[PDB]
């Protein structure tokens, strides 16, 4: 998820307001990327034996 496109969409005005909450969009994208890499790990360790 692009946390900024989700929360604000195209708006620059919303994007500037959003930046004042700081790291939260980075935390969200980092969590979803970790979940995504775990799915390749899961398939690797089940099938690539």
């Amino acid at each position: 998820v692009d946390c900024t496109m989700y929360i604000c969409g195209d708006s620059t005005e919303c994007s500037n307001l959003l930046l004042q909450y700081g790291s939260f969009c980075t935390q969200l994208n980092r969590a979803l990327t970790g979940i995504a890499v775990e799915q390749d790990k899961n398939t690797q360790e089940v099938f690539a034996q």
Binding site: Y21, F24, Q27, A31
Partner: protein
């Protein structure tokens, strides 16, 4: 606290409280899920032992 009188300050402080408390909740939730992952790995290591 150096700069605004009490009733104007209280609104600004309530904004800081809200966002900081949400940052703490995010931390403690992610730590509870990491704790479950390490707990599972510790149970596996106890079995391996």
């Amino acid at each position: 606290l150096s700069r605004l009188d009490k009733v104007e300050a209280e609104v600004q402080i309530d904004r800081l409280i809200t966002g900081r408390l949400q940052s703490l909740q995010t931390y403690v939730t992610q730590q509870l899920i990491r704790a479950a992952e390490i707990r599972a790995s510790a149970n596996l290591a106890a079995i391996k032992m």
